[PDB]
Amino acid sequence: ETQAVEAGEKTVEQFVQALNKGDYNKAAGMASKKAANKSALSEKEILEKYQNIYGAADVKGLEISNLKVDKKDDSTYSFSYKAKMNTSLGELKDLSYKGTLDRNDGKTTINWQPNLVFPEMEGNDKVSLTTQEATRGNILDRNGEPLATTGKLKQLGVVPSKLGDGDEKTANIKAIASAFDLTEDAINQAISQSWVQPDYFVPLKIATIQEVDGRYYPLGEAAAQLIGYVGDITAEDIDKNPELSSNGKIGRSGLEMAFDKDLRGTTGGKLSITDTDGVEKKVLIEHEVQNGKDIKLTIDAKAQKTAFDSLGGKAGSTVATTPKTGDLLALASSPSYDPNKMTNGISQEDYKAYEENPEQPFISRFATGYAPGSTFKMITAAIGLDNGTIDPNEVLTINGLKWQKDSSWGSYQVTRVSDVSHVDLKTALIYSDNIYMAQETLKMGEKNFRAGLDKFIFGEDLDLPISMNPAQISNEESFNSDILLADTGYGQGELLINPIQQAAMYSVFANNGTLVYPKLIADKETKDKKNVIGETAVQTIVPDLREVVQDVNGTAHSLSALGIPLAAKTGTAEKENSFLFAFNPDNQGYMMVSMLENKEDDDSATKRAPELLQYLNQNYQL
Ligand SMILES: *C(=O)[C@@H](NC(=O)/C(=N\O)c1nsc(N)n1)[C@@H]1NC(C(=O)O)=C(CC2=CCN([C@@H]3CCNC3)C2=O)CS1
């Protein structure tokens, strides 16, 4: 407790603090002159040491404790303290520093020595710092087949110096643009790029070829919206997260981005003290690299490749689930983009292409909310049946195509397409009679309609890694209209449900009225919501839904040619959308929901479903 002691106690601290602030020169100013019993190096020689070592290892957050300064002679005090510090590779704990001070004319300074960098350093000792980036994990389908993996790829390229001079170049460019099937002009824009030197290898496809490590998506565009793609890491990404290395790739969309942490692993590293020849003398930190985790999904890659191909590139979406457990067997969206071109290199043209396609390939339509249309009637009936409103056999008598409750609906008319004039429940679903449904809905009223709807999952967010707004009944918490109460009853109005949310609500017909939440991660436990509708309302509706197919006038009669047990409902909306709902009523092994955004003349979701239905029907039973 002496005013010379604490003068030295303060001179240590100002030295430590100067190193935290990274002011390696202020620190160097507190060094005794270079001498045999004082410092071991000059101010400049000291400055350089800390910049080399404390900088290259980014030493910061230096905390000392148990500081001691005791007198040894009138001009020399000995100090000692414990310390901990943060390095770019971890925390250094329980360091033991020791040294001496030089009092001379009321000026107290440090007799610097290498053992104030790290305790065990001596003489001409140095420091080494090595890092090892990890390998990105895989995304797998339910059967282990890979959906996103990192492997060696046969990169094709050329060398401007092994071509032709004049006609031998512009005719040889022809030959390699053929045996590989790529445009011939793009070989000229590439060869004449800025960075090209006539000796470098210039890449073309995913004439010499070299093996390159890259990120590969076997299914390409058939699963590009769900799985996503990955991009070069940019300086900005490191601002958002300085734990990233400049050399990896990063998930930018779809599941790659949703699970980037798990998939990307942790970097390994090693901080060592070496003699003057890089020979390791003490290891201070060693974190063995930990690679990225694999991720197993519910997807069935054949169902996905089939479901996407079935849309023939038209705007639309398909979604398949095993309804008794929630497994999502496929999440198709069309049109689409090449996720391999995006990740591993995409020409400036093929890229500008996707951006201006007005049907928007980058949209994950299976998460876009739509107005479901007539398919929804299978709910409305099930609610009406639950609360007594609907008599299956009560036969309404309905004339013409238009209708309204009374003249106070101005020009708002409920329209249908088939002038059936004796409609019971079964007949209503077989023909998709908006009117019958619009009526039996009003017979039920917002209170009893919402009483049933509210037993579903509107508003809720599902436990899935896909960004999607929840499904809504209306753009306000009440309808505030009869017309809307009606429009909503037959699948329009202010309804918004996306193909995954639809597939969840309709699961009630495969589970005696229990709703089963969708499942996308292979291991996660099934989650359900019991008694959403009555078992009896199911046994009433389903046999009517078979007849949407079998009956010669059924909206989906074309599917009876297949010879497979189907129960289903269709839809259409107005540009014209087209819908289909389908599942197996014998075994409940699968269920599908297919849309067609902006259909073509005489095209339909129902005309494209068979190939996917045959696969599902055979490979998913009990
Ligand atoms: C349910 O979605 C209903 N569709 C419509 O009424 C719509 N347009 O057709 C629609 N509602 S709102 C809005 N803006 N437009 C019924 N569903 C279907 C269907 O599922 O296919 C309809 C089409 C349709 C029923 C029977 N069809 C036979 C084809 C040849 N002749 C009849 C048929 O195309 C309309 S009613």
Nearest protein Cα to ligand 1, atom 11: 573
Q: Provide the residue count of the chain.
A: 622
Mutate to test the pocket of ligand 1, among 417, 492, 545 (most ligand atoms within 8 A of CB): 417
Q: Is residue 135 classed exposed, middle or buried when 0-12, 13-18 and 19+ CB atoms within 10 A define those classes?
A: middle
How far apart CA 395 and CA 439 sit, in angstroms, is 12
How far apart CA 421 and CA 516 sit, in angstroms, is 37
How far apart CA 173 and CA 170 sit, in angstroms, is 5
SS3 state at 214: strand
- Ligand 1 atom nearest the C-alpha of 492 is 12
Interval between CA 222 and ligand 1 midpoint (Å): 29
Interval between CA 399 and ligand 1 midpoint (Å): 17
Tokens of 447: 């209170």
In eight-state DSSP terms, residue 198 is: T
Report the residue numbers after which the chain has a gap, meaning the C atom sits over 2.5 angstroms from the next written residue's N, or none: 206, 574
Sign of CA dihedral 425, 426, 427, 430: positive
Interval between CA 73 and ligand 1 midpoint (Å): 102
Task: Provide φ and ψ at 43, rounded to 5°.
Answer: -60, -45
The answer to whether residues 525 and 477 touch, using CB atoms and an 8 Å cutoff, is no
Interval between CA 15 and ligand 1 midpoint (Å): 82
CB atoms within 10 A of CB 411: 6
Which of these, 553, 541, 473, 481, lies nearest to 513 by C-alpha position? 541
Give the distance from CA 575 to its chain's centroid.
31
Tokens of 280: 């390791």
Nearest protein Cα to ligand 1, atom 15: 573
The answer to whether residues 365 and 499 touch, using CB atoms and an 8 Å cutoff, is yes
Tokens of 307: 């479901």
In eight-state DSSP terms, residue 299 is: -
How far apart CA 224 and CA 151 sit, in angstroms, is 18
Beta partners for residue 99, in sequence order:
79
Here the contacts of 344-347 (C-beta below 8 Å, separation 24 or greater) are 344/153, 344/206, 344/214, 344/215, 344/216, 345/203, 345/206, 347/186
How far apart CA 362 and CA 466 sit, in angstroms, is 14
Mutate to test the pocket of ligand 1, among 378, 555, 595 (most ligand atoms within 8 A of CB): 555
Tokens of 364: 């994950």
Q: Is residue 429 classed exposed, middle or buried when 0-12, 13-18 and 19+ CB atoms within 10 A define those classes?
A: buried
Q: Which amino acid is at 101?
A: L
Active site residue 65: no
The answer to whether residues 60 and 22 touch, using CB atoms and an 8 Å cutoff, is yes
* 98 conformational bin, left if phi > 0, alpha if psi -120 to 50, beta if neither: beta
Resolution reading in Å: 3.3
Catalogue all structural domains in the chain, each as residue range(s) with its CATH number.
3-132 (3.10.450.100), 303-619 (3.40.710.10)
DSSP per-residue string spanning 384-431 = HHHTT---SS--B---SS---SSGGGTT-----SS--SSB-HHHHHHH
Nearest protein Cα to ligand 1, atom 28: 555
Sign of CA dihedral 208, 214, 217, 220: negative
Q: Which residues contact 516 (CB under 8 A, 6 or more apart)?
A: 323, 324, 325, 326, 504, 507, 510, 526, 527, 528, 529
Interval between CA 571 and ligand 1 midpoint (Å): 6
CB atoms within 10 A of CB 501: 27
What element of type H or E holds 567? strand 567-573
Nearest protein Cα to ligand 1, atom 29: 555
Which of these, 225, 279, 267, lies nearest to 467 by C-alpha position? 225
How far apart CA 415 and CA 409 sit, in angstroms, is 14
- Ligand 1 atom nearest the C-alpha of 569 is 20
Beta partners for residue 140, in sequence order:
146, 296
| Torsion angle (degrees, nearest 10) of CA 80, 85, 87, 92 | 80
Mutate to test the pocket of ligand 1, among 374, 380, 419, 492 (most ligand atoms within 8 A of CB): 374
How far apart CA 152 and CA 213 sit, in angstroms, is 4
- The residue assigned the tokens 């490191």 is 238
Task: Provide φ and ψ at 478, rounded to 5°.
Answer: -145, 160
Mutate to test the pocket of ligand 1, among 423, 430, 431, 432 (most ligand atoms within 8 A of CB): 432
Tokens of 535: 């078992």
DSSP per-residue string spanning 13-34 = HHHHHHHHTT-HHHHHHTBPPB
The answer to whether residues 284 and 272 touch, using CB atoms and an 8 Å cutoff, is yes
> What's the first-to-final CA gap in the chain, in angstroms?
84
Q: Are strands 107-110 and 90-104 parallel, antiparallel or unpaired?
A: antiparallel
Which of these, 552, 618, 542, lies nearest to 582 by C-alpha position? 542
- Ligand 1 atom nearest the C-alpha of 555 is 26
Cis peptide before 392 (omega within 30 of 0): no
Interval between CA 432 and ligand 1 midpoint (Å): 7
How far apart CA 377 and CA 383 sit, in angstroms, is 10
CB atoms within 10 A of CB 513: 21
Q: Which amino acid is at 173?
A: I
DSSP per-residue string spanning 493-528 = TT-BB-HHHHHHHGGGGGTTT-EE--B-BSSSPP-E
The answer to whether residues 276 and 125 touch, using CB atoms and an 8 Å cutoff, is yes
SS3 state at 67: strand
* Cα–Cα distances in angstroms (integers) from residue 576 to residues 154, 226, 431, 490, 509, in the given order: 44, 26, 18, 16, 27
- Ligand 1 atom nearest the C-alpha of 574 is 14
Which of these, 411, 415, 466, lies nearest to 436 by C-alpha position? 415
Output the ligand 1 site: residues, CB below 6 A: 373-374, 416-418, 432, 434, 491-492, 555, 570-574
Interval between CA 417 and ligand 1 midpoint (Å): 6
The answer to whether residues 468 and 258 touch, using CB atoms and an 8 Å cutoff, is no
Q: Are strands 76-87 and 90-104 parallel, antiparallel or unpaired?
A: antiparallel
Q: Which residues contact 132 (CB under 8 A, 6 or more apart)?
A: 267, 268, 269, 289
- Ligand 1 atom nearest the C-alpha of 490 is 1
- Ligand 1 atom nearest the C-alpha of 570 is 20
In eight-state DSSP terms, residue 253 is: S
Nearest protein Cα to ligand 1, atom 20: 571
Catalytic one of 253, 272, 317, 374: 374
How far apart CA 327 and CA 93 sit, in angstroms, is 48
Tokens of 157: 């390229």
- Ligand 1 atom nearest the C-alpha of 432 is 16
Interval between CA 489 and ligand 1 midpoint (Å): 15
Which of these, 209, 207, 211, lies nearest to 162 by C-alpha position? 207
Q: Which residues contact 175 (CB under 8 A, 6 or more apart)?
A: none
